Amino acid sequence: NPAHVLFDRFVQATTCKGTLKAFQELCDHLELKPKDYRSFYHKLKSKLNYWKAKALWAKLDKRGSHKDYKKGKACTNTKCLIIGAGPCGLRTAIDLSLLGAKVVVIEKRDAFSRNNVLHLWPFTIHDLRGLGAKKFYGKFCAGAIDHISIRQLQLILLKVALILGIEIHVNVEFQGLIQPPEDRIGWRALVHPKTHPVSEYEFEVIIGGDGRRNTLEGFRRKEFRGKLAIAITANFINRNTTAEAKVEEISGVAFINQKFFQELREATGIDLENIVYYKDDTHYFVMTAKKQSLLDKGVILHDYADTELLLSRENVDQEALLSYAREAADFSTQQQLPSLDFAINHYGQPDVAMFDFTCMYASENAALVREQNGHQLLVALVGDSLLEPFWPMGTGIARGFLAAMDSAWMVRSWSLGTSPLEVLAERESIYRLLPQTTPENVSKNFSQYSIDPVTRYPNINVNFLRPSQVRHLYDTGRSSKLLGWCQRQTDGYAGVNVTDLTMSWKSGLALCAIIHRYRPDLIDFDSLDEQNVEKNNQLAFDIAEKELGISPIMTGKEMASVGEPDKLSMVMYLTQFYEMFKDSL
Numbered sequence: 001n002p003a004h005v006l007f008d009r010f011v012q013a014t015t016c017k018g019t020l021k022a023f024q025e026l027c028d029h030l031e032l033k034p035k036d037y038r039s040f041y042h043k044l045k046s047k048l049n050y051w052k053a054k055a056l057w058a059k060l061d062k063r064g065s066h067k068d069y070k071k072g073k074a075c076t077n078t079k080c081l082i083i084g085a086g087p088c089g090l091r092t093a094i095d096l097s098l099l100g101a102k103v104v105v106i107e108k109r110d111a112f113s114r115n116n117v118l119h120l121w122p123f124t125i126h127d128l129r130g131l132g133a134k135k136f137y138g139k140f141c142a143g144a145i146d147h148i149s150i151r152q153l154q155l156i157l158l159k160v161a162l163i164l165g166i167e168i169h170v171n172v173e174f175q176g177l178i179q180p181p182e183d184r185i186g187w188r189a190l191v192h193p194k195t196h197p198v199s200e201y202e203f204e205v206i207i208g209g210d211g212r213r214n215t216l217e218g219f220r221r222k223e224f225r226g227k228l229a230i231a232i233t234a235n236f237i238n239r240n241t242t243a244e245a246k247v248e249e250i251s252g253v254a255f256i257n258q259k260f261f262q263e264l265r266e267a268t269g270i271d272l273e274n275i276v277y278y279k280d281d282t283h284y285f286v287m288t289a290k291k292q293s294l295l296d297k298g299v300i301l302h303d304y305a306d307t308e309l310l311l312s313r314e315n316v317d318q319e320a321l322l323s324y325a326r327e328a329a330d331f332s333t334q335q336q337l338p339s340l341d342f343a344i345n346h347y348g349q350p351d352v353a354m355f356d357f358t359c360m361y362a363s364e365n366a367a368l369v370r371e372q373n374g375h376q377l378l379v380a381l382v383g384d385s386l387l388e389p390f391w392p393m394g395t396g397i398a399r400g401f402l403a404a405m406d407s408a409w410m411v412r413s414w415s416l417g418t419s420p421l422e423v424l425a426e427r428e429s430i431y432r433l434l435p436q437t438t439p440e441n442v443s444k445n446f447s448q449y450s451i452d453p454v455t456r457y458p459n460i461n462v463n464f465l466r467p468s469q470v471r472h473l474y475d476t477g478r479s480s481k482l483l484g485w486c487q488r489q490t491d492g493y494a495g496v497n498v499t500d501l502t503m504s505w506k507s508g509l510a511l512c513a514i515i516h517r518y519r520p521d522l523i524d525f526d527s528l529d530e531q532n533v534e535k536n537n538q539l540a541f542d543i544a545e546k547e548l549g550i551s552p553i554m555t556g557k558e559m560a561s562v563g564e565p566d567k568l569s570m571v572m573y574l575t576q577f578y579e580m581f582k583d584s585l
């Protein structure tokens with residue numbers, strides 16, 4: 001069965017682009033429209049009768065049947081935008097999908113490239129298994145493995161997300177919010193490129209899952225400055241031989257082995273406070289190295305006053321850095337690994353990297369609400385943008401996923417009509433615990449974990465803060481859409497300037513430009529003479545009729561002499577181009 005082959009190719013895809021393409025090919029073959037999100041998942045599992053697929057349906061159905069989701073109707077009418085397809089953005093997206101919301105994720109990259117390896121708490125392993133992780137990554141947490149690379153976690157969550165009808169757009173950089181206009185269009189996003197279909201999306205919830213670079217306004221950062229702290233990560237090719245399998249992991253609770261560090265410093269000049277080894281798709285090491293040792297070995301060329309000069313690509317000898325990392329890895333595993341060949345990163349270089357942990361950040365607040373021109377927008381942070389992890393402690397995914405579930409619960413309460421201040425008060429009451437969570441003070445009964453915070457935080461007081469304590473987090477300060485669409489799509493075209501839906505169309509160049517924007521094979525826009533008003537109009541009209549099936553409302557000569565085109569007719573005509581092409585860039 002060809003649909004089975006397409007499903008297999010989707011499941012087995014090894015890149016973000018390859019996953020998106022296999023999924024689109026599966027949907028086309030099955031004649032399914034993911035953008036009709038309220039029915040997509042049910043139609044897909046009805047149409048695809050494949051034993052492999054049915055195994056996955058049972059897991060997702062079981063997850064979605066929890067009473068917290070209200071059978072998928074708690075958020076049926078809520079539109080959410082997620083910034084970032086990292087693990088925490090995608091995990092949030094997935095729970096928002098199970099509540100019935102429409103969800104769109106925009107991601108500025110188009111590849112999952114990070115090889116570094118993430119520690120997983122037991123509850124997260126159980127969460128991921130329950131989402132079908134093993135059907136996308138057969139080796140997932142095999143035996144006593146409790147880690148996974150960043151990019152493999154991204155691939156699993158991407159696949160789950162696509163199955164549920166979540167929309168994922170790569171090569172889209174979020175730049176800002178666009179307030180609603182006056183007098184009905186809601187909140188929108190400024191994205192690059194602004195011609196992207198997602199510029200049409202109006203949403204009531206936006207989630208910042210874009211790590212440190214996140215620049216949603218209204219989230220003041222708390223700074224935690226400590227002693228100079230430098231971490232080095234490294235990945236080596238893992239050929240899964242028997243020699244390689246025998247080498248024992250180094251857990252990262254193991255450093256509390258200080259004699260080893262003294263021996264290592266005296267034998268090699270490498271002075272570490274901690275080193276971690278995970279045996280995963282790569283042999284992954286992370287270590288924290290003292291500044292003086294890195295100068296002594298030539299990794300850092302000059303000792304600058306403070307760090308961002310100290311750790312600049314100009315002040316760091318890459319070959320010495322590679323040597324230092326390999327040497328530390330080899331000694332820490334006692335030269336039992338046959339070979340230490342660097343895996344190759346995004347840029348085609350050996351995969352070593354250095355990071356500054358001297359200052360870490362966390363948002364004062366997880367959420368806020370914006371209201372303008374009658375439209376309310378729930379804004380919240382999740383993941384590294386909310387609370388930065390110190391990798392050796394293994395809290396990144398655990399607290400990202402707690403906050404993902406907390407955010408889902410917040411959006412559930414929003415959609416059910418809870419007043420904004422009570423939504424915020426509850427969210428902030430939950431958020432106050434996040435930097436105290438450990439595998440032992442968080443709930444133990446994984447089989448009953450749900451987005452309901454009571455299932456995850458024993459004895460939580462969700463009314464710790466009063467609504468009056470979060471007043472400062474509520475901030476009060478012609479199809480116009482069609483017009484805005486034509487403006488963005490025609491921007492940059494010589495001779496065109498769309499300021500209305502009548503006068504700006506008499507020359508014919510604007511519509512020729514709309515056609516060229518989406519079907520450059522049908523028209524040479526550059527060859528056109530702006531003075532040939534009748535010829536250019538009629539060319540646009542004929543192409544649209546013959547190639548696009550849009551019936552003309554007038555002739556070129558009628559347009560060339562009209563004075564002002566009827567606007568009801570202009571709008572009926574232009575809207576057909578809008579509907580044909582708006583989702584289609």
Ligand SMILES: Cc1cc2nc3c(=O)[nH]c(=O)nc-3n(C[C@H](O)[C@H](O)[C@H](O)COP(=O)(O)OP(=O)(O)OC[C@H]3O[C@@H](n4cnc5c(N)ncnc54)[C@H](O)[C@@H]3O)c2cc1C
Nearest residue numbers: 084086087088106107108116173174210211383384391396
């Ligand atoms: C280079 C690097 C190495 C790391 N190494 C380790 C490690 O060894 N061990 C460890 O435990 N943790 C490590 N981490 C942290 C770990 O990746 C995160 O804790 C984890 O992935 C969860 O973070 P997140 O999903 O919130 O954000 P991230 O994983 O940072 O994902 C953010 C996503 O948002 C996208 N994005 C950013 N800005 C925009 C925008 N304007 N528009 C659209 N998309 C945008 C980014 O491309 C990215 O895909 C590393 C992080 C980085 C950046």
